[PDB]
Design an enzyme around this catalytic site. Sequence first.
Site, PDB file in Angstrom:
ATOM      1  CG  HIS B  41      -0.571   0.258   2.690  1.00  0.00           C
ATOM      2  ND1 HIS B  41      -0.130  -0.666   3.454  1.00  0.00           N
ATOM      3  CD2 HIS B  41      -0.118   1.491   3.419  1.00  0.00           C
ATOM      4  CE1 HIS B  41       0.313  -0.381   4.405  1.00  0.00           C
ATOM      5  NE2 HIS B  41       0.329   0.942   4.495  1.00  0.00           N
ATOM      6  CG  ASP B  90       0.057  -4.002   2.858  1.00  0.00           C
ATOM      7  OD1 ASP B  90      -0.239  -3.486   1.712  1.00  0.00           O
ATOM      8  OD2 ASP B  90       0.395  -3.615   4.029  1.00  0.00           O
ATOM      9  N   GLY B 190       2.718   5.110   9.712  1.00  0.00           N
ATOM     10  CA  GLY B 190       4.125   5.490   9.789  1.00  0.00           C
ATOM     11  C   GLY B 190       4.996   4.210   9.846  1.00  0.00           C
ATOM     12  CB  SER B 192       2.764   0.802   6.493  1.00  0.00           C
ATOM     13  OG  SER B 192       1.542   0.810   7.035  1.00  0.00           O
ATOM     14  N   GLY B 193       5.109  -1.561   6.103  1.00  0.00           N
ATOM     15  CA  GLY B 193       6.298  -2.204   5.630  1.00  0.00           C
ATOM     16  C   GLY B 193       7.416  -2.361   6.445  1.00  0.00           C
TER      17      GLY B 193
HETATM   18  N1  LIG Z   1      -4.014   4.137  -0.084  1.00  0.00           N
HETATM   19  C1  LIG Z   1      -2.939   4.914   0.108  1.00  0.00           C
HETATM   20  O1  LIG Z   1      -3.028   6.049   0.434  1.00  0.00           O
HETATM   21  N2  LIG Z   1      -1.694   4.457   0.248  1.00  0.00           N
HETATM   22  C2  LIG Z   1      -0.570   5.298   0.263  1.00  0.00           C
HETATM   23  C3  LIG Z   1       0.082   5.076   1.829  1.00  0.00           C
HETATM   24  C4  LIG Z   1       1.464   5.160   2.042  1.00  0.00           C
HETATM   25  C5  LIG Z   1       2.017   5.045   3.086  1.00  0.00           C
HETATM   26  C6  LIG Z   1       1.078   4.815   4.352  1.00  0.00           C
HETATM   27  C7  LIG Z   1      -0.003   4.872   4.194  1.00  0.00           C
HETATM   28  C8  LIG Z   1      -0.995   4.763   5.242  1.00  0.00           C
HETATM   29  C9  LIG Z   1      -2.091   5.693   5.331  1.00  0.00           C
HETATM   30  C10 LIG Z   1      -2.867   5.676   6.538  1.00  0.00           C
HETATM   31  C11 LIG Z   1      -2.896   4.773   7.678  1.00  0.00           C
HETATM   32  C12 LIG Z   1      -1.702   3.972   7.446  1.00  0.00           C
HETATM   33  C13 LIG Z   1      -1.502   2.944   8.654  1.00  0.00           C
HETATM   34  C14 LIG Z   1      -2.118   2.613   9.667  1.00  0.00           C
HETATM   35  C15 LIG Z   1      -1.513   1.964  10.217  1.00  0.00           C
HETATM   36  C16 LIG Z   1      -1.821   1.037  11.476  1.00  0.00           C
HETATM   37  N3  LIG Z   1      -0.856   0.250  11.927  1.00  0.00           N
HETATM   38  C17 LIG Z   1       0.310  -0.042  11.216  1.00  0.00           C
HETATM   39  C18 LIG Z   1       0.498   0.589   9.868  1.00  0.00           C
HETATM   40  C19 LIG Z   1      -0.506   1.449   9.691  1.00  0.00           C
HETATM   41  N4  LIG Z   1      -0.301   2.096   8.635  1.00  0.00           N
HETATM   42  C20 LIG Z   1      -0.695   3.888   6.332  1.00  0.00           C
HETATM   43  O2  LIG Z   1       0.505   3.167   6.344  1.00  0.00           O
HETATM   44  C21 LIG Z   1      -0.752   5.049   3.029  1.00  0.00           C
END
Ligand SMILES: NC(=O)NCc1cccc(-c2cccc(-c3cc4cnccc4[nH]3)c2O)c1
Lengths: 96, 254, 151
Positions: B41, B90, B190, B192-193
């Site tokens: 994502h 993901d 923040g 994620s990944g």
């Molecule tokens: N669909 C989209 O906009 N993707 C781009 C993108 C890029 C990087 C981060 C996000 C992103 C946007 C909103 C929420 C998250 C997020 C919530 C969350 C909760 N827990 C762990 C990781 C998480 N990531 C998140 O990772 C979204």
Amino acid sequence: GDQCASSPCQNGGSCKDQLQSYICFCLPAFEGRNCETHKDDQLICVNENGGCEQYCSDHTGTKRSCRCHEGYSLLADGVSCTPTVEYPCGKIPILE
Amino acid sequence: IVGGKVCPKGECPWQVLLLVNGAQLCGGTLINTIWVVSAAHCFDKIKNWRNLIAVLGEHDLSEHDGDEQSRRVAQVIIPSTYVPGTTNHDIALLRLHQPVVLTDHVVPLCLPERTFSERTLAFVRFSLVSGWGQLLDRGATALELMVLNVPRLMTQDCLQQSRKVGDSPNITEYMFCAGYSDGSKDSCKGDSGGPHATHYRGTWYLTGIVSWGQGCATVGHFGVYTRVSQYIEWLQKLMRSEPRPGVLLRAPFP
Amino acid sequence: TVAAYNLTWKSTNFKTILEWEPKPVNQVYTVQISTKSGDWKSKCFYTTDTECDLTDEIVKDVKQTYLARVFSYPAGNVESTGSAGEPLYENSPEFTPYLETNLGDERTLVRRNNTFLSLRDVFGKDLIYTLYYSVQAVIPSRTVNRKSTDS
Ligand SMILES: NC(=O)NCc1cccc(-c2cccc(-c3cc4cnccc4[nH]3)c2O)c1
């Protein structure tokens, strides 16, 4: 067996009678209600990774073989791995 | 990362920080010098592809010390089964433009063998998740890399313990839950990944990838991780394939 | 595959066996036991029995609270996992040997330096006996199975 009378405890264990029931005291290498399972015969990979430090492979009719990740080599003991590189993966240099 | 600690510089050497136009994007894990695994994502919006960089050796985002290495991300490969906006499949495999150098602050995390991951790693209770994501839901992102030890759960137990609704997808075979339900500790936006790394007899392995679903330490929820065991094969194959001429590549999965 | 149920802990002088149902029809079971923060350890690998001796594990730390689960695999396809790619299972109750094992000088199944320890060596000043004022062993600090039987 049935209650002590009928020596329920196998592989050298001792019985203790209770309220009909008994308890078997086994020898270090066996376990089970009746000291029947041989600890020494479950050297399989699903069982504490086969005793392998890294990868395990069970083999048909033969002892399982342990392996290692790239950057590592199996040691004499057949279970341990040692790195064959500088920065082997999964290791934290400042903690080594 | 909510309820974590700071990962003492160098204790999370596989951690990656992806930035787009200088802006923090997501985290990622280094599996070898030119390959980093992150979450698909993260690249759902990216329209300035050539402005995507990965930094290794990063700890403190405010001061620059010797140890950081930046590389442009040559290619981003995500499963052909991922759907932008979802949390299933993901995972993203990134090909750096030039390899990083390994040093005490840049080491790859072992990508385990599937069997070993499913049979042994999956039953190691705690694993570490890390990142520069919010320290509280909707809170301030961190500056010093944070790490949190989370217990993993088999889906039966996860479904059993989570509360019924919210913008909560299902937990598929490609995800797994780890965390707490009393909204005190969890990965957060923040992060994620980033990695979910498991320690087994002296080595650390990549068991999960910080995915999204739930919104950081939500009470009655656990964090969801992409179950990497299901992608080992895919990754490895991709890493041995020849560069193909796309920045974003939707590689066939399985 | 059907999941096990009525997972019970039969424990006397620490000899601990998990028992459960059903009697397997074309399936096998493996048991995993852990402490709340420990990794799961597997036992009674792909058995057809409906009991699993866990003594060995719980006597490592009788004061821990163990939890155990039984996995059910179709026999033949021990790699059967369900929709969420994991094997079907069911959890036991929690068992804190120390506060829940049943009692009957006596030796217990707890071992130290390869030997076995005794009732008093495990319960120390928590164990008393009755007479009238016949004997019964009591651990009056428990919630459950506070007295033993008589002789
Ligand atoms: N669909 C989209 O906009 N993707 C781009 C993108 C890029 C990087 C981060 C996000 C992103 C946007 C909103 C929420 C998250 C997020 C919530 C969350 C909760 N827990 C762990 C990781 C998480 N990531 C998140 O990772 C979204």
